[PDB]
Amino acid sequence: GSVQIVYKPVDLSKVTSKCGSLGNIHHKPGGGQVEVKSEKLDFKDRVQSKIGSLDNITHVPGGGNKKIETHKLTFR
Amino acid sequence: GSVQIVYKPVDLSKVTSKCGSLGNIHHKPGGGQVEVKSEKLDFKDRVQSKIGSLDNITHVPGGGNKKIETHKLTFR
Amino acid sequence: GSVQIVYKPVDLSKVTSKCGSLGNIHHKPGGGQVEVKSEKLDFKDRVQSKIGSLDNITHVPGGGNKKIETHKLTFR
Amino acid sequence: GSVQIVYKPVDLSKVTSKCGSLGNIHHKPGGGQVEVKSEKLDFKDRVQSKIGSLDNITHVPGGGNKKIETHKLTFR
Amino acid sequence: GSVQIVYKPVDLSKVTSKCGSLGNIHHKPGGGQVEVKSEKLDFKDRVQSKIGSLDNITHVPGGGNKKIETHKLTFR
Amino acid sequence: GSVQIVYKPVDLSKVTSKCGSLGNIHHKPGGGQVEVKSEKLDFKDRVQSKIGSLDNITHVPGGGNKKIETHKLTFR
């Protein structure tokens, strides 16, 4: 019973993005107000909490192409 | 029972980004107010908390291409 | 039972980013106010907390391409 | 023609206010945003302008009784 | 023609205010944003302008009673 | 023509304010942002301008009673 696995992917890809000019981006928030009123937290595993986070972002890349992959062979 | 694994991926890829000019980005937040009122925290594992984080970001890269990958062979 | 593993990935990739000029980035926050009111913390493992962090960032790289990878062979 | 004026008002008044206790007043605005876009102003007399005034007030007096009066004899 | 004026007001008044206790007043604004964009101003007389005034007030007097009066005899 | 003026006001008044205790006043603004963009000002008389004044006040007197008066006899 010669188990045999020849796992062999190939990949010849491209993720291009040609752009002319990024200009005149304004972003002027106006404050606000948050108020959490809790008692206890008991986080236990892989928790990713964000309690009462008033914030702003301006993510303006000239690129932004993401090519995520994943492989796995859970042999038993 | 000669178990055999020939795990062998290939990758010939490209993630390019041609851009002209990044200009005139303004980002003028206006404050705000946060207020958390908790009692106890009992974080226990891999916790990633952000309690009451008033903040701002301006992430303006000339690139930004991300190529994440992952492999695994959990043999038993 | 001559177990055999020939784990052998290849990688011929590129993550390029051609840009013209990064210019005229302004970032003028306006303060704010935070107030946490807790009693006890009992962090225990791999905790990554940020309690009441009022802050700002201006991350403006001429690059920014990230190529993360990971491999693993948990043989038993 | 002995013109005669015997202008003579009297006033025996009271403006009282008995109160027990002023307590637990909260006032938590949430920001906002204004934007005026004008060209010219040409104010000329007794003008009382307030252009684009984002503001807040908390006027909590233990009194507040106002007794305004006015007299006049424009004789000719 | 013996013109005669006997202008003679009297005033026996009171503006009282009895109060118990002023307590627990909170006032927590949350910022905001204003933007005026004008060209010329040409104020000329008794002008009282307030252009783009973002502000806050907390006027909490234990009194506050105002008794304004005015008299005049513009004889000709 | 013996013009005669017997201008003679009287005033027996009181503006009292009895209070118990002023306590626990909080006032926690949260910033903001103003921006005026003008070219010329040409103020000429008795002008009282306040251009772009971001500010705060906490006027907490134990009194505050104001008794303003005015008299005038513009004889001709």
Per-position DSSP letters for E5-56, written without gaps between them: E--------B---B---EEEE----------B---EE---SS----BS--EE
Chains that touch B (3 or more CB pairs under 8 A): A, C, D, E, F
Query: From E14, which residue of chain D is nearest by alpha-carbon distance?
Result: D14
Please give the interface size between A and C, counted as residue pairs whose CB atoms are below 8 Å apart.
10
Query: From F28, which residue of chain B is nearest by alpha-carbon distance?
Result: B33
Q: Which two tokens stand for residue D68?
A: 């305004």
Which residues in chain C are contacts of A61 at CB distance < 8 A?
A: 64
Contact E34, D52 (CB under 8 A): yes
Which residues in chain D are contacts of E65 at CB distance < 8 A?
A: 15, 63-67
E13 Cβ contact partners less than 8 Å away, ≥ 6 residues apart: D11, D12, D13, D14, D15, D67, E67, F13, F14
Is the Cβ pair E33, B28 closer than 8 Å? yes
CB atoms within 10 A of CB B12: 14
Q: Which two tokens stand for residue E19?
A: 């109060």
Which residues in chain C are contacts of F33 at CB distance < 8 A?
A: 28, 30
Which residues in chain D are contacts of B32 at CB distance < 8 A?
A: 31
Contact: chain E with chain A (3+ CB pairs below 8 Å): yes
Strands E40-41 vs B22-25: parallel, antiparallel or unpaired: unpaired
Contact: chain D with chain C (3+ CB pairs below 8 Å): no
Query: From A57, which residue of chain B is nearest by alpha-carbon distance?
Result: B57
Task: Name every residue in F having a CB less than 8 A away from some CB of A.
Answer: 30-33
C49 Cβ contact partners less than 8 Å away, ≥ 6 residues apart: B43, B47, B49, B50, B51, C41, C43
How distant, in Å, are the alpha carbons of B68, C17, C59 from that of A64? 13, 10, 15
Give CA–CA dist A45/B19, Å, rounded: 42
Task: Name every residue in A having a CB less than 8 A away from some CB of F.
Answer: 28, 31, 33
Please give the interface size between A and E, counted as residue pairs whose CB atoms are below 8 Å apart.
14
Is the Cβ pair A30, E31 closer than 8 Å? yes
Query: From D32, which residue of chain B is nearest by alpha-carbon distance?
Result: B30
Give CA–CA dist A65/A76, Å, rounded: 36
How distant, in Å, are the alpha carbons of A4, A7, A22, C7 from that of A1? 9, 18, 61, 21
Contact B43, A40 (CB under 8 A): no
Give CA–CA dist C48/F23, Å, rounded: 40
- Min Cα separation A34/chain E (Å): 9
State which approach was used to obtain the coordinates.
cryo-EM
Give CA–CA dist A60/A62, Å, rounded: 7
In the beta sheet, which residues pair with residue B55? A55, C55
Which residues in chain E are contacts of B31 at CB distance < 8 A?
A: 30-32
Resolution at which this structure was determined, Å: 3.5
- Min Cα separation E34/chain C (Å): 12
Give the residue from E62, D59, E25, D14 showing the smallest Cα distance to F65.
E62
Question: Radius of gyration (Cα) for chain D, nearest Å?
Answer: 23
Which residues in chain D are contacts of F32 at CB distance < 8 A?
A: 31, 54
- Min Cα separation D1/chain E (Å): 5
